[PDB]
Design a protein around this ligand. Sequence first.
Ligand SMILES: [Mg+2]
Ligand SMILES: [Mg+2]
Ligand SMILES: [Mg+2]
Ligand SMILES: [Mg+2]
Ligand SMILES: [Mg+2]
Ligand SMILES: [Mg+2]
Ligand SMILES: [Mg+2]
Ligand SMILES: [Mg+2]
Ligand SMILES: [Mg+2]
Ligand SMILES: [Mg+2]
Ligand SMILES: [Mg+2]
Ligand SMILES: [Mg+2]
Ligand SMILES: [Mg+2]
Ligand SMILES: [Mg+2]
Ligand SMILES: [Mg+2]
Ligand SMILES: [Mg+2]
Ligand SMILES: [Mg+2]
Ligand SMILES: [Mg+2]
Ligand SMILES: [Mg+2]
Ligand SMILES: [Mg+2]
Ligand SMILES: [Mg+2]
Ligand SMILES: [Mg+2]
Ligand SMILES: [Mg+2]
Ligand SMILES: [Mg+2]
Ligand SMILES: [Mg+2]
Ligand SMILES: [Mg+2]
Ligand SMILES: [Mg+2]
Ligand SMILES: [Mg+2]
Ligand SMILES: [Mg+2]
Ligand SMILES: [Mg+2]
Ligand SMILES: [Mg+2]
Ligand SMILES: [Mg+2]
Ligand SMILES: [Mg+2]
Ligand SMILES: [Mg+2]
Ligand SMILES: [Mg+2]
Ligand SMILES: [Mg+2]
Ligand SMILES: [Mg+2]
Ligand SMILES: [Mg+2]
Ligand SMILES: [Mg+2]
Ligand SMILES: [Mg+2]
Ligand SMILES: [Mg+2]
Ligand SMILES: [Mg+2]
Ligand SMILES: [Mg+2]
Ligand SMILES: [Mg+2]
Ligand SMILES: [Mg+2]
Ligand SMILES: [Mg+2]
Ligand SMILES: [Mg+2]
Ligand SMILES: [Mg+2]
Ligand SMILES: [Mg+2]
Ligand SMILES: [Mg+2]
Ligand SMILES: [Mg+2]
Ligand SMILES: [Mg+2]
Ligand SMILES: [Mg+2]
Ligand SMILES: [Mg+2]
Ligand SMILES: [Mg+2]
Ligand SMILES: [Mg+2]
Ligand SMILES: [Mg+2]
Ligand SMILES: [Mg+2]
Ligand SMILES: [Mg+2]
Ligand SMILES: [Mg+2]
Ligand SMILES: [Mg+2]
Ligand SMILES: [Mg+2]
Ligand SMILES: [Mg+2]
Ligand SMILES: [Mg+2]
Ligand SMILES: [Mg+2]
Length: 183
Amino acid sequence: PHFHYSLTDEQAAELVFKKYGVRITPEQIAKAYAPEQRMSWKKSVEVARFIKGMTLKQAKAWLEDVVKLKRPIPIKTFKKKQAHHATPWEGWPVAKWPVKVAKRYLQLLENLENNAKFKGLDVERLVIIHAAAHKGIKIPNIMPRAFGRATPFNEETVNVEIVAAELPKEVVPKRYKLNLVKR
RNA sequence: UAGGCAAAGCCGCCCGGUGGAUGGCUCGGCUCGGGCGCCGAAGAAGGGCGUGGCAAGCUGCGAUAAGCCCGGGGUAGCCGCAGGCAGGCUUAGAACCCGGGAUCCCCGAAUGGGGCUUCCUGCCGGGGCCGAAUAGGCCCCGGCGCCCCGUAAGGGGCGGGAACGCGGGGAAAGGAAACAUCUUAGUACCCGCAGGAAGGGAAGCCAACAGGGACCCCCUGAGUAGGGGCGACCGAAAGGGGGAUA
RNA sequence: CCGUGAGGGAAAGCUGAAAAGAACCCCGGAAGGGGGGUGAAAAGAGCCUGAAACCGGGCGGCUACAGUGGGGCAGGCCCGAAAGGAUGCCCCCUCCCGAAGGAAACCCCGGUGACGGGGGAGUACGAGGGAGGGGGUCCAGGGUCUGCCCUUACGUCUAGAAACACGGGCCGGGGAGUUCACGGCCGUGGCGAGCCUAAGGGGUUCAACCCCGGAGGCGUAGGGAAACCGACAGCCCGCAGCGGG
RNA sequence: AGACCAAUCAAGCCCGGUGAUAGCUGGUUCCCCCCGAAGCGGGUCUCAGCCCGGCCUCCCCGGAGGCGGCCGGCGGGGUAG
RNA sequence: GCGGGGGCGGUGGGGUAAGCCUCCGCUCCGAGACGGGAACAACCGAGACCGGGGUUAAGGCCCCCAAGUGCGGGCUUAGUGU
RNA sequence: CGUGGGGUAGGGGGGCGCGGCCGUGGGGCAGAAGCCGGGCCGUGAGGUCCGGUGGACCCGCGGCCGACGAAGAUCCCGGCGGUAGUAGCAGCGAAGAGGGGUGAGAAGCCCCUCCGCCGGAAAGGACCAGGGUUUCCUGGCAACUUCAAUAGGCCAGGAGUUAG
RNA sequence: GGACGGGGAACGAGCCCCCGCGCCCGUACCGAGAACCGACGCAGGUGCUCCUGGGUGAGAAGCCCAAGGCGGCUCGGGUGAC
RNA sequence: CGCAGGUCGCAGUGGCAAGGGGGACCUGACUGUUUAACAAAAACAUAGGUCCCCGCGAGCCCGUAAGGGUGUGUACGGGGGC
RNA sequence: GCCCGGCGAACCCACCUCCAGGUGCACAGUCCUGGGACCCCCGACGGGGCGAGAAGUCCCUAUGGAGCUUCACAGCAGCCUG
RNA sequence: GACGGGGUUGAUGGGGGGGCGGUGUAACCCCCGAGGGUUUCCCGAGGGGAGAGCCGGCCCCUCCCAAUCGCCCGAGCGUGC
Ligand SMILES: [Mg+2]
Ligand SMILES: [Mg+2]
Ligand SMILES: [Mg+2]
Ligand SMILES: [Mg+2]
Ligand SMILES: [Mg+2]
Ligand SMILES: [Mg+2]
Ligand SMILES: [Mg+2]
Ligand SMILES: [Mg+2]
Ligand SMILES: [Mg+2]
Ligand SMILES: [Mg+2]
Ligand SMILES: [Mg+2]
Ligand SMILES: [Mg+2]
Ligand SMILES: [Mg+2]
Ligand SMILES: [Mg+2]
Ligand SMILES: [Mg+2]
Ligand SMILES: [Mg+2]
Ligand SMILES: [Mg+2]
Ligand SMILES: [Mg+2]
Ligand SMILES: [Mg+2]
Ligand SMILES: [Mg+2]
Ligand SMILES: [Mg+2]
Ligand SMILES: [Mg+2]
Ligand SMILES: [Mg+2]
Ligand SMILES: [Mg+2]
Ligand SMILES: [Mg+2]
Ligand SMILES: [Mg+2]
Ligand SMILES: [Mg+2]
Ligand SMILES: [Mg+2]
Ligand SMILES: [Mg+2]
Ligand SMILES: [Mg+2]
Ligand SMILES: [Mg+2]
Ligand SMILES: [Mg+2]
Ligand SMILES: [Mg+2]
Ligand SMILES: [Mg+2]
Ligand SMILES: [Mg+2]
Ligand SMILES: [Mg+2]
Ligand SMILES: [Mg+2]
Ligand SMILES: [Mg+2]
Ligand SMILES: [Mg+2]
Ligand SMILES: [Mg+2]
Ligand SMILES: [Mg+2]
Ligand SMILES: [Mg+2]
Ligand SMILES: [Mg+2]
Ligand SMILES: [Mg+2]
Ligand SMILES: [Mg+2]
Ligand SMILES: [Mg+2]
Ligand SMILES: [Mg+2]
Ligand SMILES: [Mg+2]
Ligand SMILES: [Mg+2]
Ligand SMILES: [Mg+2]
Ligand SMILES: [Mg+2]
Ligand SMILES: [Mg+2]
Ligand SMILES: [Mg+2]
Ligand SMILES: [Mg+2]
Ligand SMILES: [Mg+2]
Ligand SMILES: [Mg+2]
Ligand SMILES: [Mg+2]
Ligand SMILES: [Mg+2]
Ligand SMILES: [Mg+2]
Ligand SMILES: [Mg+2]
Ligand SMILES: [Mg+2]
Ligand SMILES: [Mg+2]
Ligand SMILES: [Mg+2]
Ligand SMILES: [Mg+2]
Ligand SMILES: [Mg+2]
């Protein structure tokens, strides 16, 4: 089945003008989709939020450091009973190192890099403008319990969509922006 | 002081994901009316197993195994559900439909005898094979159930079928605002036995001095007479009108 | 498929007119993704439409010194194309009429006084209803937030429910006075000292419809257990109505 | 030990009678308009039910009187004190 | 519908008493909105079709809170009391 | 005209909606039903229109009939939440490590070395019932294994049980 | 298997050599802390049912080690508060 | 299996393995059995004691019946109580 | 256990609740009058939420059961007798 | 999570040397040893001497190794009373 994006190319350009002050055409937009990935759905949402507004190289470098357990990911929404940690950013103490989710996002970023390159876009000026994860279909399974009862033990898959735009180099951020209160 | 100005969180709309509602559809169901109505030792119904080039299920079929023969209809396509890959069949008339035949494994009333495994095994007669042998052994085919009728030759019963029919055995729950007689009910259910229908049927009748005229079924008589802790409740018959008529 | 067994037993329909069932290029270990195609439409084989709950993203409003939901009034921000008004709405000014109600300054009389009374004055004003002029730009409606005022979840039995009385996590779909017989009564319709046919029969354009069928049922008379017997227009009061004054 | 007789025993399980019965408990689905109660008396194996009256409602007949108040005339009464 | 309940009155009758039991009567709640009583079915006021204007009822008028730090006399020293 | 306007149970009177039928009048591929949002009308049940989506049926009016209206029944069936990236994946006296290979990818698959546990046995040898292909070979990783996987009692294809 | 009897033939063995025949069904694998039953790849139950070397020791006890098997009673790492 | 001598340790059945003991009362004699899943007991049973029905075509018990159990038995026996 | 990586449920859930003293179907998160609180997150606990679990087994009621008893009302076998 | 110290302009952890401490005297060598035998050059539990040996989640000294390379946050402007 085909999966649609929450945002069409026409509104992606409109969003780019609203956030960067520049006008671009749908020819400067690259997309990729990773349907039904077997990974944590809550941590996928946190990753998509964090890498939005990064350049593609910035997101790749950070995620490659999550895999090595050298940089964490902030957990803003799914934080009940999650411990605090020292963080490289400012304004939020709840952090995780989702290795499995990071590896899948790196494959999606690899597909997105190719899709932009195939269009002739300059990858150094590619900026992630929209990222979203969705709970996909469930793969049902049961866990036998005590007293003759069985309870659900499900694999909830994740649909990840990503859209990036090629911006003029004079408006592209050159460093990480890591004030999470202001972000 | 308020704005630029933002945490986590809240509300609303749009888009997406999830979900499968709604709407439309319908080769399915249900109800009613009409027809038609038995199958089985000539081995049934039911079941098991097998059967397709690639085939698991369903459907069909039975080692001749989605099929064989003859005839009629039907003419050019065909190889079931089932839209694939091959290879074939068919104008010397197929597929398909209808009638008649052939084949029809094992179990099954199952019937030579067993059967704790739908498989095993005996005797007799005939045949084949191994074998030097005519011995011995092995294999194939046929007969071999019980109870009966008949002098015998021979013949009969058995099992099945959605409901309906005939004979017998035969409750309780509930109701009676408790409950026992009673009712429920000669019901549920059980046992036996038939047919395409069964049962009934040809006055030791009914009536009332006037007369009907075998029987069954329908309408009525009638919730009347009558039965009944005369309570709950139960409940005709003759007569009259019809279906049909022997 | 469940139970040793007697027995018990689900869920599950829909591509398109036509496969035209997605060539080809790039990426991926692969599921697959991007580009590019087919078609009227992706309707993409996880296949019509594709709601809500639910989750993600975007947008609008709020957000860390202020206790929550609902209603009214006033305001902030945002939407306000169509289907509503724009002959609108708002402000100012002027004019007219005006219900119930209705002052004040000031003069006079009283009281220690709060205040009362006569005049001013049924005036100024007053719900609303009419007419005109100047100025402005959207108004209505909607989302959200703030201020002020008001405000004790629902369903239920109960004398008494916000109850520390019980039931519901949410959403969708489903989910409860029916039919026959008999009786009483009502509202109408047909016929009327009569009313209706039942089963059934003939025809049909064949369960409809037309015609036949009066058996029987109820009514026309009651009293009595039964044998048995078996019925009014005479007088008064008087509503309606009619006639007289 | 009223143990155990297939997770079942002061009387198994399966299917049937069977939609057993329940004066008891739960539920009973759209809108507006008119009027508007009762928990009293009597009887009942009656006391968580039901029937006959009181109280509600709707329709019809009938046809001129009626009475939660007061005054007076004529009566009754045996309480407070 | 045949479970009633609150206020007041019959020293009702009973009971140590009871937000107690059992009668008699008016009213109210049940089935009655609203103002006052701090909250509060039945205490006080009062009965609501909808919108608006006005005036009163109970009760209140230092602030919370609309309206008086209202007027004369007297008492209390306990924050009694309100 | 009314010193008319509260109301539970209950009685009485009128209307709205849903599915079909008998009539009548219409709409629809120049877009029906359904669906999302919105304006207008009605006290209200509800009606109607607009924009979007959709792709073939539907509606007004009169009459008639019902398998006819849900917020609730520890209601039924399905779906899906918060809980929550939480509990558990400890306890029953074994456990791993280094190097190499394979592979897209290796703590975990294969080989060696080191370390450990059983040894009258939750563990080695045999084997009944029961199971029925789980056996063996080749290949594989969507699902399955409380984690991983290139492994496997899993999946696909092939094969295998010999008696005086 | 033997003995004790009865009947029959003229041949003929339990010894030696030599010839022939022996049907039908089962046979893989697990046999259990993952192949059985318990909804499960379940610390239970079935089956430890039958068998087991050396040292110590009374011992088929425990402990240690062979033959033989296992690291699959199918999560890993860090920290060293309560 | 014993004797003599030497000698070390906190500890010599050094780990492993492996009884705490005594006095008295109540109670059931004892071993045994029991509420599978809250009771293991003083409850049940028991050997022993005693009573009853019975000479067998009996006594007691099962079956609608045909018939059956005790009984392939016989008072030193079968059945039934305490 | 806690922290990291991986898998990934359930109970329960009208909505969801700072404290005091009142009031009320007499034991209030939601009403009244006060007192406080910058918001969010982690660990822990078990005082409260008349916490969750289970249509109270206690007790009563029903013209409800079951089983058991006998000197209940009846009935049927079995045995004895004509 | 936080907190505190150091971060080359440095003794922050390790290594090395030294101090202090725990245990109890390793190896090698020499002597004694109940007794027995290849007769007294061998066996032999054990005792003595010299040397301790092993070890430190403590202290000092010494740059030998590592405190590196790097990644971020951050006010700046208006308006009214
Ligand atoms: Mg179990
Ligand atoms: Mg997952
Ligand atoms: Mg935020
Ligand atoms: Mg057959
Ligand atoms: Mg046979
Ligand atoms: Mg027959
Ligand atoms: Mg019945
Ligand atoms: Mg009865
Ligand atoms: Mg009874
Ligand atoms: Mg006949
Ligand atoms: Mg006949
Ligand atoms: Mg009868
Ligand atoms: Mg679709
Ligand atoms: Mg507009
Ligand atoms: Mg307009
Ligand atoms: Mg109650
Ligand atoms: Mg009560
Ligand atoms: Mg309530
Ligand atoms: Mg209740
Ligand atoms: Mg609940
Ligand atoms: Mg007992
Ligand atoms: Mg029984
Ligand atoms: Mg019974
Ligand atoms: Mg039953
Ligand atoms: Mg009224
Ligand atoms: Mg009740
Ligand atoms: Mg008088
Ligand atoms: Mg007196
Ligand atoms: Mg009463
Ligand atoms: Mg009273
Ligand atoms: Mg009531
Ligand atoms: Mg008040
Ligand atoms: Mg004031
Ligand atoms: Mg009214
Ligand atoms: Mg109509
Ligand atoms: Mg309701
Ligand atoms: Mg549910
Ligand atoms: Mg959940
Ligand atoms: Mg844990
Ligand atoms: Mg061990
Ligand atoms: Mg392990
Ligand atoms: Mg060992
Ligand atoms: Mg041992
Ligand atoms: Mg073994
Ligand atoms: Mg294998
Ligand atoms: Mg293999
Ligand atoms: Mg397999
Ligand atoms: Mg074998
Ligand atoms: Mg296991
Ligand atoms: Mg070995
Ligand atoms: Mg762990
Ligand atoms: Mg020990
Ligand atoms: Mg004893
Ligand atoms: Mg027990
Ligand atoms: Mg015990
Ligand atoms: Mg005893
Ligand atoms: Mg004695
Ligand atoms: Mg005695
Ligand atoms: Mg974790
Ligand atoms: Mg109180
Ligand atoms: Mg509460
Ligand atoms: Mg906690
Ligand atoms: Mg109860
Ligand atoms: Mg109960
Ligand atoms: Mg009673």
